[PDB]
Ligand binder design. Sequence first.
Ligand code: ATP
Ligand code: ADP
Ligand code: ADP
Ligand code: MG
Ligand code: MG
Ligand code: MG
Lengths: 462, 154, 460, 56, 474, 125, 125
Amino acid sequence: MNKGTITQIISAVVDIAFKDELPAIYNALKVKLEDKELVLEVEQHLGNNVVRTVAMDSTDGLKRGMEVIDTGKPITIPVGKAVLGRILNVLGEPVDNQGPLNAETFLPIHREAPEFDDLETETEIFETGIKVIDLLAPYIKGGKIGLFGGAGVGKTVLIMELINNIAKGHGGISVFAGVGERTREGRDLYGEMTESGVITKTALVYGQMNEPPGARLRVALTGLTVAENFRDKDGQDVLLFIDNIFRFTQAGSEVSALLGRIPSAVGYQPNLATEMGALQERITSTKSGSITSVQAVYVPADDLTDPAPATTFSHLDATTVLSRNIASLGIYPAVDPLDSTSKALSEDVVGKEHYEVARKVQEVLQRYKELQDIIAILGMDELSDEDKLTVSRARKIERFFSQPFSVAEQFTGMEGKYVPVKETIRGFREILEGKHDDIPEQAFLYVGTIEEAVAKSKDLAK
Amino acid sequence: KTVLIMELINNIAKGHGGISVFAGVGERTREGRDLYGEMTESGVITKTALVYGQMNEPPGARLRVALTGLTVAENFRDKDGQDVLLFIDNIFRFTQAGSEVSALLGRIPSAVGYQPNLATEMGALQERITSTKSGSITSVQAVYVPADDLTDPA
Amino acid sequence: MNKGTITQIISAVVDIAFKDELPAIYNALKVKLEDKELVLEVEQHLGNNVVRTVAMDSTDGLKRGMEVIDTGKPITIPVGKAVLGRILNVLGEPVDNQGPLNAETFLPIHREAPEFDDLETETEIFETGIKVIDLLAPYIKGGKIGLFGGAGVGKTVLIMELINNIAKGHGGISVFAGVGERTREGRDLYGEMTESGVITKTALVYGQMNEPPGARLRVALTGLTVAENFRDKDGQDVLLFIDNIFRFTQAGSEVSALLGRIPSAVGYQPNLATEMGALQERITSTKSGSITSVQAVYVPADDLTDPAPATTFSHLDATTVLSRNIASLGIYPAVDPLDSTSKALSEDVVGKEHYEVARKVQEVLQRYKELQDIIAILGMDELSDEDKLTVSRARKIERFFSQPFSVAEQFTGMEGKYVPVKETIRGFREILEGKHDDIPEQAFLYVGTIEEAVAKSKDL
Amino acid sequence: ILNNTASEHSARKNSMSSATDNADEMIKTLNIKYNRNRQSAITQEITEIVGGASAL
Amino acid sequence: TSGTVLEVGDGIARIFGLSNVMSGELLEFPHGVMGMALNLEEDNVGAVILGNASLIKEGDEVRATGKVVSVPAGEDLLGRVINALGDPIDGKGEIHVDKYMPIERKASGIIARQPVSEPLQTGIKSIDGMVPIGRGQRELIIGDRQTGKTAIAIDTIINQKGQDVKCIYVAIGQKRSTVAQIYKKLSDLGCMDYTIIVAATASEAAPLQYMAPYSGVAIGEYFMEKGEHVLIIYDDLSKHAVAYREMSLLLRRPPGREAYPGDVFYLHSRLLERAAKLSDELGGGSITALPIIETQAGDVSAYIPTNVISITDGQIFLESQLFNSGFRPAINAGISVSRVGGAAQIKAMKQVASKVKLELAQYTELLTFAQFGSDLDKATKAQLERGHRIMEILKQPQYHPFAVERQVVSFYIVINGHLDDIEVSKVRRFEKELLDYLKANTNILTEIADKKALDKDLEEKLKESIANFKKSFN
Amino acid sequence: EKGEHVLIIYDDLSKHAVAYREMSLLLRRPPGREAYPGDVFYLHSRLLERAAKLSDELGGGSITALPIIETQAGDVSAYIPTNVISITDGQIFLESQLFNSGFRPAINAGISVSRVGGAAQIKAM
Amino acid sequence: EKGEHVLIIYDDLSKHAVAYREMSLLLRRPPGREAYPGDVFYLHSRLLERAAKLSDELGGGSITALPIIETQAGDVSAYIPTNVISITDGQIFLESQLFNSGFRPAINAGISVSRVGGAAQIKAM
Ligand SMILES: Nc1ncnc2c1ncn2[C@@H]1O[C@H](COP(=O)(O)OP(=O)(O)OP(=O)(O)O)[C@@H](O)[C@H]1O
Ligand SMILES: Nc1ncnc2c1ncn2[C@@H]1O[C@H](COP(=O)(O)OP(=O)(O)O)[C@@H](O)[C@H]1O
Ligand SMILES: Nc1ncnc2c1ncn2[C@@H]1O[C@H](COP(=O)(O)OP(=O)(O)O)[C@@H](O)[C@H]1O
Ligand SMILES: [Mg+2]
Ligand SMILES: [Mg+2]
Ligand SMILES: [Mg+2]
């Protein structure tokens, strides 16, 4: 049925001419390339019964006038429980070997997002274990979480800790989606998943750096399509982890040029807002089920005004910004406590003490940041006695936010310490009130509890 | 700068004799009625002619409205021969209207995305606003400064 | 001769159509005008047997459908002894009004760079015969030197001496490429070249700002081709001056703009790296000879990160920074000893003695520049007791770097002074050690060897 | 009083020496930040001009 | 069939016909120059010329070879200088090859790889000390102009002598003066035997510069697939990117950040992905990559530096501050990292050198406020002395790498505190003479090399031998 | 029109503009500054002008407009933020330097102005 | 040519460039930095060079050029200023900081340069 011929090829885009019937948009085409077949995706209808298609794999080898067949439906994927504990392709194929999948049901990649009124309003937090996050920017169950970070400021590390804290010792289903990041991390994770035993409940999809643009574009969806199935069909709460969602929006720009679209600011595609909305709004908690998504956002050249990171901000309930200034200062996790915010931080949700303390440390840290200009050129001795005490407390609070990570145990050589929400608020309160003014600032780094902070101060004295 | 023009009218045009001409070139329509209110109560309305083409109006209007208000003033200095006061607010919006359309007229954009014939378009209109031997006009024209940047072409 | 016809003209660029044969890229074309024949250079093939060209002169006069003659080769220029002491056009024509050239050899301007095995793989140090340079900013054979200067800081004097020192000192000949030269400063250069009597010991190639962008681009290569000949044909060292290299860089972007290419980062040509490399890779040390080069560099907005100087700095081997502060103080040549730096300043290259001397000299000079804040306002008296002995050395060191120049003879009256490296080392080595501590600092001013420095103190 | 004022100025020498050094290094970073933006501002300017012409 | 050129300029060509030509197919223009079929349009074919585009013009015939662009890979290449295309540059006769391998080839999947085990030793005390590299790792060498970037790259190639590891130094946008002097040095020291040099220098056309690194890794694939260990060195990528930028802008592809096209990330991401260690299923071979990148005034938060940092497995920062201060190799321990870690490092090495990294970072912070407190704590004063001494040990000269056994002892000296009484001045020679003492007499160096761990006995055995040398020293 | 008071709110025009950018660049209406089309002023000019108070002759019915704009690191020199500021009858500035400092709502009195003034205030106020 | 000495004053070349820019951009000539064509340096070079002193053989007359150029917030690195500076023999830099301070004409000696220098001065001076 519906067989056509290739008119012209242009890197990652191919133009095909159909004699009779023309395939609808997002339909999957197939060409019999040398040995293995290649999958293409139709995008535009040009004219003279011709369609412009983006390839899902390398186009090297394609001649002009080759045969190509329409499937009719979009790219459909094995979906359901069959996929669990197996790494999947962009096309939905298993790349882990270990036989073919036990696929019962199927479902297309491209499908409209949940309409208004199908959505549900839930505003309950959950402790991550991480002090800076749990206090200032607490994550929300069934919410969209965002991890903004420049090149190598510990955003992938942070994910690996969050899956280790949340998805490890909990009964719920999980989903991971590798998008245009390291293939090393793929093997590293798949090993750590199996040996830990989380592999069983979680499902993996991968389309990494090595993969062409078309692949990196659509992998973001397939994994989401899998995550959608569990909140819909089974009606079960699922977790979705993506790294890195930027690489999806990035791929767009590589393709957009070839589709002949007029470039917008910083040579991005002009449909950046909608192309991202058509994905991001699909990642949401409905009535039928609930998805808690935690996706990482790469910031190119540490430039958050860049339109790719800029637009993503307006799709998130909680956001955790990672600053290079903090990482360089030698503090991990390198979380900016002022730039990072969450919708849940309100008396309604977190209570009185949580909110009261959270706003107080922000006020102190803000004042430290204000005076940081003057101190840089003159010194600490010049600023008034009133400021002097607030600065000294700020530097301790700032360093207390640092704590060792279980994933980075091999790195740091320290037992990563999970701190509960109630013991964090206790700590930042005692430090603020000035009951730990006697303790040095070098007794707060990579500690955890405040009880352990004083233990480090006594360890010195010996 | 709008309030300043309003004061200059209140000080000069109200007290002194002769006619005047106000040209609302692509600014707030609210302010139009606010002037017209002060004009009629002060009794200056009789000795002044008002031409308007505000924000709400399309490009073509905001473009050529300045020329209408100018042409009224041109007449009063030459034909009539009386002393004229020409107030314009704002003469940036003339250029702005130019830039909107410029792109669609097939003009390649110049520095900081203006029309390439910025100097001549303005020069053609500005040189026309002047006193002559046959009569003199006192032009007080407010100028917008995009983002407080005086290096901006306009 | 293969002949064509003009299709369209837009200022600098000209499109030309041929019937039978089409000229290869960088081929020289010629159109006949009553005044003078205009030379064009084909850049690309468009289609329908049409090719686009850039003019080396103005196009005010050209009609459509004019006869054009394909030379069938990239614009060729005369080389050898016929070029010495002559002012050359980009096209190799004379413009000094000194009769015709009778050259017996012609090499094209466009040619590929020396191959891998041809290059001499040895860091042979080059001595100019000047103390400050050879010690602190050592040149290299087949090297690229950055001449940070401009304005009245004795730049053209330094160049004229460097030309005279290689001509007398070694069996060498110099070349000068006036890329975007001022017509005023062109005449005044040729003037002072004949005055000093160095005119014969160099080749002059001017491509004025007056001429179009095509001219300024290729004039850099014209002089390089002349230098290429003296290294390739004759077995001798060469010294190729370029001023200014940025005017070559900027000519490139001006051309790239006219041709209608998409501008790269900061609005420079997309082929900034290759077009830069094509020239600089040609300047190197073969087994047969060596072309050393002193290039002046403009730095836009005093920015080093700017692509034009940044891509240039890739090729640069050493740098020589002229200071107005030192020029005003009355120390010639100026040559800031701290700003000036080199690849060649290392034990592996020059030697252990040479190295540790230069280091100590700079550390003391730095310590003087630190205590320059105090002595300027307070005085030499109002200072620490221990540093004053090291300051008294530093002031003598800086004044010892002053050097009588052969080219200056006409003005100063004093005879010149070439100085090899071993003579300088000993001189500076003794001063910092503290043998000639008793010698006044006024004796060191404008003297050659340390032997002559102590001799002048008794004279005074 | 002589000792105190002698000490005063010796102390002021220290504070101002470090202040100057801090300023010197602050100027460096800012100059790089400036040129970073300079470069960007020129690039962007051209992108918009080329982008406008090529679209036509 | 076949084709003819109807339009050419700026290293790009338009070709008529070529009915049965495929995407990225090698082409053959007259005068020996070749290209890659790029844009297979309806009425014409696009091509990127891989050489001097002057020699090609409109009218000239073009014949499709039938094969994808590929580089001649073999075991004959070892000790030869090659260009991007694969032709001999050195001038040591023709090159007989077993295989022809493609330059552009998708990297291996997830299960096709395994965690790295065995280390790759650069032979520098600082690098192998506290920022170790594994066979299959990707480690960036980032720094300003002239900070000993290439120095570290070649010193790694040197140390691979007598460890059965092939080397591929691909010179992208360099000058031949540099490439030739490297070829001369390597051949003199006798490390050129097992080393290949790919060259697309500044003179050569941008497409050749674009091609070079892909050609380099493709030759590296030859040895990996068989089941051997390879080292590849991209010198450098910041030139490679500009080369690709030149092409893209001449192809009229829309510019992005700093005029670099949208797929300048994918340029390097897909390249470096091909460097990894395969599983035992595919034969336990590896390609270890050392890419280089040249920052402008230490601007590591520029477009490309961040691109490359985000695809590599860590990086090595080199400051001009340290370099000009007289500390080479000028490695910044506080910033530099290696993501593999102690998985690929010797036990003996981890026992001594693991403590250092953090101590150095703190050391520098102690130096900064040492200005203020005219007097300071005496326990802290000891750390500065240790810090001064340990730093002097980390400083080593060029073209002189150390064996792991020699590195172990070098660290053991200072970290245990047997050098505390020794003056800072003569610390470098004190190390030299001590290893020479242990070499001939006690032969404890060979004990470490074979054992690869310090046990209860050998640790005290080492403490005895140094105590003898302490007395012997004058 | 019926003669009732309305309070419309646009949340937010900075995003509204980006949509119009999408439309234009797809329709092949050429780009301007920050890739925005020619009439992104006129876009918001005709919308905001629509808000007014009519005379007593046409009911006296109002329609107050509160547009919102999203600045990038406090950059008000940007194309759209500056556009809208010049259209409206004043503006309200919010700075995180205050918001984080513990001053909510974080209004900067210095830059914030109302071009109607005390005309729209009770005498007591 | 008649051996007379002339003074010519261009007021100013910054306005002149903009006039040439207009022509080029309307002729659809490819734009460059700040939307100027490639031959804007060439435009000014062939004008300024045409002002010089001839030899005694060719009359002995001269044309002295005083071009003026307008800088925006002291931007000397802008495309026209930077390149017009490069052409001319010397430069006279004026500053508003001096002008407002009461210095007239507000000339900055430090940065002002004349490469001709002493050659164009009488012994007395
Ligand atoms: N470990 C070292 N010890 C002593 N000298 C060194 C060392 N490493 C490099 N050098 C010296 O520093 C100079 C520059 O080193 P190198 O060329 O490796 O840096 P680079 O960043 O690669 O330079 P470029 O960017 O110009 O290619 C060389 O001349 C070399 O002699
Ligand atoms: N939580 C942490 N604790 C200690 N070190 C960290 C932490 N996060 C990151 N790092 C350091 O920074 C590096 C960057 O981590 P990564 O997650 O790869 O950043 P990104 O994903 O942003 O590139 C790590 O290799 C590690 O050395
Ligand atoms: N003479 C004045 N006295 C006090 N405030 C003024 C005066 N002129 C303007 N303002 C302030 O500025 C606002 C009006 O400015 P406006 O005339 O609209 O300037 P623009 O025309 O530049 O927008 C008012 O809200 C008022 O607070
Ligand atoms: Mg990551
Ligand atoms: Mg107003
Ligand atoms: Mg190097």
